[PDB]
Amino acid sequence: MKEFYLTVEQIGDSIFERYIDSNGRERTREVEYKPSLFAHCPESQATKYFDIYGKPCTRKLFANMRDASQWIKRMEDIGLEALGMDDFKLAYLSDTYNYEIKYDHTKIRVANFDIEVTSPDGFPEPSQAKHPIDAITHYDSIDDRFYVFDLLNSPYGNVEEWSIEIAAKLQEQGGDEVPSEIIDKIIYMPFDNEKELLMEYLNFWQQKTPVILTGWNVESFAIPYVYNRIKNIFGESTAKRLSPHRKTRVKVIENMYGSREIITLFGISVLDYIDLYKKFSFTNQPSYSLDYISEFELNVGKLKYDGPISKLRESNHQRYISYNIIAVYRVLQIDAKRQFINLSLDMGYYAKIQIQSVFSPIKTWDAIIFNSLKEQNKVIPQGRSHPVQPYPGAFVKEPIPNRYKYVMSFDLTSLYPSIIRQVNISPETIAGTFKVAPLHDYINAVAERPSDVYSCSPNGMMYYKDRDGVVPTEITKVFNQRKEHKGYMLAAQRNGEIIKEALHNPNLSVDEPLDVDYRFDFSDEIKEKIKKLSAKSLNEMLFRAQRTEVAGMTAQINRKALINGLAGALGNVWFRYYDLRNATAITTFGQMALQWIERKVNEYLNEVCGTEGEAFVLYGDTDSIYVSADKIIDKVGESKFRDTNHWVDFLDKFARERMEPAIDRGFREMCEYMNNKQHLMFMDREAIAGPPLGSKGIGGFWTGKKRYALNVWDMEGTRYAEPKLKIMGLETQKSSTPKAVQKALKECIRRMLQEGEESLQEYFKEFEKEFRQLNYISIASVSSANNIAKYDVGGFPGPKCPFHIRGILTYNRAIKGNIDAPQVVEGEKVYVLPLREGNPFGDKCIAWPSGTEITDLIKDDVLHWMDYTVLLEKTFIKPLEGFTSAAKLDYEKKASLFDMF
DNA sequence: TCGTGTAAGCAGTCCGCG
DNA sequence: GCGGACTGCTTAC
Numbered sequence: 062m063k064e065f066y067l068t069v070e071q072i073g074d075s076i077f078e079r080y081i082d083s084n085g086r087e088r089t090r091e092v093e094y095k096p097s098l099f100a101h102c103p104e105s106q107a108t109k110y111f112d113i114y115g116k117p118c119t120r121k122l123f124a125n126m127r128d129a130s131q132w133i134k135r136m137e138d139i140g141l142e143a144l145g146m147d148d149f150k151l152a153y154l155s156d157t158y159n160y161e162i163k164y165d166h167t168k169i170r171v172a173n174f175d176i177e178v179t180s181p182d183g184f185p186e187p188s189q190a191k192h193p194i195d196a197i198t199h200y201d202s203i204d205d206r207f208y209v210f211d212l213l214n215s216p217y218g219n220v221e222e223w224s225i226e227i228a229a230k231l232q233e234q235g236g237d238e239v240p241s242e243i244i245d246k247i248i249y250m251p252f253d254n255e256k257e258l259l260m261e262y263l264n265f266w267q268q269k270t271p272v273i274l275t276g277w278n279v280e281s282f283a284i285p286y287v288y289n290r291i292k293n294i295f296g297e298s299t300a301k302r303l304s305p306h307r308k309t310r311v312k313v314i315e316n317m318y319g320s321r322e323i324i325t326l327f328g329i330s331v332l333d334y335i336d337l338y339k340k341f342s343f344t345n346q347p348s349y350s351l352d353y354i355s356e357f358e359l360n361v362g363k364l365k366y367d368g369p370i371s372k373l374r375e376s377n378h379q380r381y382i383s384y385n386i387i388a389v390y391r392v393l394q395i396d397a398k399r400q401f402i403n404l405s406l407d408m409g410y411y412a413k414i415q416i417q418s419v420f421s422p423i424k425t426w427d428a429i430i431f432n433s434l435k436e437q438n439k440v441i442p443q444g445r446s447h448p449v450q451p452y453p454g455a456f457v458k459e460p461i462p463n464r465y466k467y468v469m470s471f472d473l474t475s476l477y478p479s480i481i482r483q484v485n486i487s488p489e490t491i492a493g494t495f496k497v498a499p500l501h502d503y504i505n506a507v508a509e510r511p512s513d514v515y516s517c518s519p520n521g522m523m524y525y526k527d528r529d530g531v532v533p534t535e536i537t538k539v540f541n542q543r544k545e546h547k548g549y550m551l552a553a554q555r556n557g558e559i560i561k562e563a564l565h566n567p568n569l570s571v572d573e574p575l576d577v578d579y580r581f582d583f584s585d586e587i588k589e590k591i592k593k594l595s596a597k598s599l600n601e602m603l604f605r606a607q608r609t610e611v612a613g614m615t616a617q618i619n620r621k622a623l624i625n626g627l628a629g630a631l632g633n634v635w636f637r638y639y640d641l642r643n644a645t646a647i648t649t650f651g652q653m654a655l656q657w658i659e660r661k662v663n664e665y666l667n668e669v670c671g672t673e674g675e676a677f678v679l680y681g682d683t684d685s686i687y688v689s690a691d692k693i694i695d696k697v698g699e700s701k702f703r704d705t706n707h708w709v710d711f712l713d714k715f716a717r718e719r720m721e722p723a724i725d726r727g728f729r730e731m732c733e734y735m736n737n738k739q740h741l742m743f744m745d746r747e748a749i750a751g752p753p754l755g756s757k758g759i760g761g762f763w764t765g766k767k768r769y770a771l772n773v774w775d776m777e778g779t780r781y782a783e784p785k786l787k788i789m790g791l792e793t794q795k796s797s798t799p800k801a802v803q804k805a806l807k808e809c810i811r812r813m814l815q816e817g818e819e820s821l822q823e824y825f826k827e828f829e830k831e832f833r834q835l836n837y838i839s840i841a842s843v844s845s846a847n848n849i850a851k852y853d854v855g856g857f858p859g860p861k862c863p864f865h866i867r868g869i870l871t872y873n874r875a876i877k878g879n880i881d882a883p884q885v886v887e888g889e890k891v892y893v894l895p896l897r898e899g900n901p902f903g904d905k906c907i908a909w910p911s912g913t914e915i916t917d918l919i920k921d922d923v924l925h926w927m928d929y930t931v932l933l934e935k936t937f938i939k940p941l942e943g944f945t946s947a948a949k950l951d952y953e954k955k956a957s958l959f960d961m962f
Numbered sequence: 963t964c965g966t967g968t969a970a971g972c973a974g975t976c977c978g979c980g
Numbered sequence: 981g982c983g984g985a986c987t988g989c990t991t992a993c
């Protein structure tokens with residue numbers, strides 16, 4: 062097999078590399094890598110190296126990496142560009158793996174771990190590590206085993222061995238319900254003392270050294286705690302055994318309001334799963350506790366125990382250990398679903414970066430572009446300092462707030478990357494500038510043609526057309542990968558709807574789910590077999606189809622994120638190819654494209670309808686248009702349709718056969734006008750929306766920019782078994798909105814769109830009447846909490862104190878003195894509840910850590926003093942009044958003349 | 963919230979608005 | 981009360 066790296070580090074003048082050799086064995090080597098860098102040279106000097114602008118360069122080979130680094134400094138001192146890859150380990154990887162890396166995940170040691178630390182005096186700070194580590198569960202992907210290290214003797218209590226037999230039993234048998242499928246995979250090791258536990262853990266770590274290290278909050282808690290605890294007990298040298306090269310450093314992570322420390326373990330790639338989740342999941346969660354996320358992702362119940370976690374070991378060590386094991390497994394289960402580790406390996410090896418660098422689109426693209434240019438013996442420019450400057454982005458049309466009955470939407474495929482490719486936008490393809498007219502003049506095609514030679518953006522920039530720039534070439538490669546995976550995702554989605562339809566008529570039989578590839582549209586044969594399957598088999602197939610869809614979603618949306626990240630990186634001062642001319646060339650072209658096609662679509666539909674100046678495009682944002690289809694439906698007449706699916710079919714055909722060709726004609730003209738390299742503005746139908754045929758539903762409504770709701774029957778070729786609400790921006794979509802209020806607002810919207818005014822009024826009256834019964838957590842608001850200290854004046858709110866911060870200050874006074882009480886953590890999320898006038902907390906609201914029950918110290922009083930009236934008005938009535946006033950309907954029945962009977 | 967970008971919505975504070 | 985200037989937070993793209 063072809064070799065591939067696992068990890069790479071620079072340590073002084075050495076590259077330390079862990080890799081899989083040609084025989085599939087893990088090896089480590091130290092290489093005295095001599096880096097090369099470049100300087101511009103005279104044109105008369107014969108060379109094969111050229112910078113991206115075609116200027117000749119001389120290669121400078123250094124005796125060692127420190128010499129190269131010193132030379133860069135002196136070049137700055139002199140005032141001359143020092144060209145080439147200054148991150149020498151990226152250059153090392155490029156030299157050592159000069160081919161497309163094919164990796165074998167089965168050879169990569171992925172470790173998932175979690176620790177427990179009993180602490181009587183509050184949160185055990187990892188930088189202090191003053192409390193014993195009393196449990197470690199460490200899962201190893203190569204062994205496929207859970208290694209459990211259990212401390213039986215501690216200053217906080219001596220306990221008996223954990224019982225695998227009790228662990229396996231149902232919670233209803235007094236067990237812990239450790240999943241049967243991992244029972245045989247547990248290797249349990251009890252310890253008489255913590256020193257023995259940690260010494261054995263390090264020996265184990267040396268034998269089975271993680272390449273990828275993950276878990277939940279491992280970078281911020283588990284790793285620093287273990288490192289510092291071992292340091293405290295044994296000294297620095299022993300703690301450094303966590304690194305295969307015995308090198309670690311404290312890294313200070315800075316943000317806007319403070320800093321925290323992590324431990325860099327040289328020769329390990331730490332991919333904390335909470336951070337993978339935040340980057341790759343495209344969710345914004347009210348809480349990021351593992352309990353909360355596992356419930357959300359896997360629909361598993363809360364890991365239930367009595368009393369505080371600080372007393373759990375002494376009271377129920379059995380459960381303590383089982384829950385530690387289950388915590389490790391839950392991360393594996395989330396990864397089995399989301400496949401973020403797989404994604405990270407894919408992206409990291411593709412770019413030829415340290416795997417942990419996948420968190421950085423700038424580092425990722427720097428490597429991709431460097432490797433690409435190096436293939437042509439081209440030399441990358443030096444990174445420069447730039448002041449942060451604001452620049453313009455997308456256009457968003459102001460919609461007229463209203464109900465909109467029939468709506469068809471259209472959207473440009475991968476807009477910003479498509480613009481980059483169409484226009485040929487790259488650092489080295491800049492050809493010059495032209496004199497810009499106001500954007501309106503290009504939109505309406507009255508401005509002079511920018512260039513008869515070069516490819517243009519309406520920001521004034523011109524680009525070469527003779528050859529593709531490196532940015533277009535590389536972005537195209539990732540776009541093509543993205544497209545493949547999006548294909549699999551949509552197939553799995555369509556396949557899911559086939560199964561949902563079949564579930565209306567399940568067969569009374571005993572059978573098995575079909576062995577199929579859900580990434581491909583079901584054949585006629587498969588569809589026929591599905592129609593004969595039992596509910597049990599169908600439901601298993603639906604689960605599998607949905608899991609396939611999720612895997613496709615992970616693969617495609619994050620490749621989309623990477624390519625859109627390149628467009629954004631052009632506007633980040635730390636990117637090697639930072640250039641606001643290029644960043645604005647993209648965004649300004651986007652503004653033109655949207656408004657150009659709005660005009661073309663309006664012109665086309667006015668022609669087909671025989672009207673003048675009527676606005677068919679009701680809304681657009683960045684690269685999408687929403688088209689009112691009322692007049693198209695009305696031209697055949699609602700009475701002529703057999704059912705909802707009939708008019709959906711009709712609009713689908715109208716969009717594909719009439720509107721899309723008109724749109725493509727419109728964009729081809731725009732391409733010619735801007736003299737672009739290649740026509741890549743591909744705008745296809747997205748949504749078909751409307752009320753159910755014969756209903757009083759309103760179909761859709763807009764309240765403002767980025768705030769709308771649609772009842773969708775077909776989305777990108779997926780014909781739903783049941784209509785799906787597409788709600789954007791409204792409170793149903795916001796993590797700050799209480800959970801039960803999201804639910805209620807969604808049902809209000811469903812009724813508005815599908816059933817009409819009377820249905821909405823019936824539901825509102827009931828919710829208003831019953832909502833006080835809802836669990837307090839379900840009706841609490843949520844907010845991130847920054848700058849708590851700034852607004853804290855002797856425990857009380859200072860000037861301009863935000864509402865949620867005031868709630869935290871109230872909480873802090875109420876728990877003052879109690880060392881065990883859960884503390885609000887700066888930068889994390891809180892639940893927030895309003896308090897009634899005259900409450901014992903002395904203020905109008907209280908806040909506590911999100912994803913948790915409020916401490917029993919104050920729970921009863923919070924419940925007693927909760928202001929239900931304010932809660933309802935603020936979170937429910939106010940947003941609903943917004944929806945209904947926009948939609949021109951009433952959530953309460955108005956008086957009429959009939960009331961007199 | 964260490965980690966690519968801008969546009970733009972709503973909650974809430976402070977305080978004007980005769 | 982509502983609305984502007986401002987901060988804070990959270991979406992859509």
Ligand SMILES: Nc1ccn([C@H]2C[C@H](O)[C@@H](COP(=O)(O)OP(=O)(O)OP(=O)(O)O)O2)c(=O)n1
Nearest residue numbers: 472473474475476477478621625683684967993
């Ligand atoms: N997180 C995001 C989302 C969007 N955009 C920009 C780049 C996109 O190209 C454009 C339009 O956003 P879309 O959500 O419609 O995404 P794309 O057009 O890129 O992809 P798709 O093919 O799925 O429509 O907005 C961005 O910079 N960052």
Ligand SMILES: [Ca+2]
Nearest residue numbers: 176177385388
């Ligand atoms: Ca725990």
Ligand SMILES: [Ca+2]
Nearest residue numbers: 472473474475
């Ligand atoms: Ca798009």
Ligand SMILES: [Ca+2]
Nearest residue numbers: 472474745777
């Ligand atoms: Ca599309």
Ligand SMILES: [Ca+2]
Nearest residue numbers: 566568592593
């Ligand atoms: Ca059937």
Ligand SMILES: [Ca+2]
Nearest residue numbers: 472473684685
């Ligand atoms: Ca879009």
Ligand SMILES: [Ca+2]
Nearest residue numbers: 973974982983
């Ligand atoms: Ca206001």
